[PDB]
Structure 1
């Protein structure tokens, strides 16, 4: 279902841009592709397919478009929100928050999990009697 093509939205996995979102604007060969992002800290570059993982979003982007046109198409469409409103982005954001939690937050999570377990066990037992 996922293929390498011009306008395909991809997620970077390896390198200093790990976890960022970009779009393929040109295909160099079968091992490297030229990608760009509207972010001001993600320069247009050439990356290998092993360092990225393809997503399910395909844009209507002309081949070899410049940075300004790519950003305009990115903003005209809902690519940022289309990716965000997905299981992949929500799970990745949840992992980011969990990794950023400190000891006090973990203690709060433990307390909340205790309350949830008590409520779930009561709910399961109550539903068993119906």
Structure 2
């Protein structure tokens, strides 16, 4: 496959109040729950299920049951962020988030530029 429930795999939370955040699996409690943690301050170390996460393609080495400090240090050292964002998957998500925050005037700014973009229609004869 391509997605394995590994100690040290980083997962993207898709449910709960931490939706959209990026955490890393530190431990496997059982078949339906895993312990995850993230260096981001807002996100606390906790036990989350598997319906509330999606597996990413990044696997980073990390010893079983590492504490919050060690996980953050390994995350910083191996450059997990800016590796996740390097993927076109993350870029699509960030594009969606910023496009959600556009107001009416920015929508008209989007209006005008992409109409300029459209009218190029230059193709070889």
Query: Under TM normalisation by the shorter chain, which class is it?
Result: over 0.9
Structure 2 residue ranges without an equivalent (≥5) = none
5+ residue gaps, structure 1: 125-130
State the superposition RMSD in angstroms: 1.3
Question: Which whole-Å CA distance do the structure 2 matches of 1:24 and 1:123 have between them?
Answer: 51
Give how far 1:57 is off.
Answer: 0.3
Question: Partner residue of 1:40?
Answer: 41
Deviation of 1:121 after TM superposition, in Å, equals: 5.1
Aligned residue number for residue 84 of structure 2 = 83
Give the structure 2 partner of residue 64 of structure 1: 65
TM-score w.r.t. length of structure 1: 0.91
Deviation at 1:108, TM superposition (A): 1.0
Name whichever of 115-124 and 91-100 sits farther off: 115-124
In the TM superposition, residue 88 of structure 1 has moved relative to its aligned partner by 1.1
Closer/same/farther in 2, CA of residues 120 and 25 from structure 1, 3 Å limit: same
State the TM-score, normalized to the length of structure 2: 0.95
CA shift for structure 1 position 92: 0.5
C-alpha distance in 1 between matches for 2:116 and 2:123 = 11
> Comparing 115-124 with 19-28, which one deviates more in the overlay?
115-124
Q: Which has the higher helix share?
A: 1
Greater Rg over alpha carbons, structure: 1
SS of residue in 2 equivalent to 1:16: coil
Residue 120 of structure 1: CA displacement?
Answer: 2.4
Write out per-residue CA displacement over residues 64-98 of structure 1, whole angstroms, 9 at most, x where no aligned residue.
11111101100111100100111111000000111
- Where 2:116 maps in the other structure, the secondary structure is helix
Runs of 4 or more consecutive aligned structure 1 residues displaced over 2 Å after TM superposition: 120-124
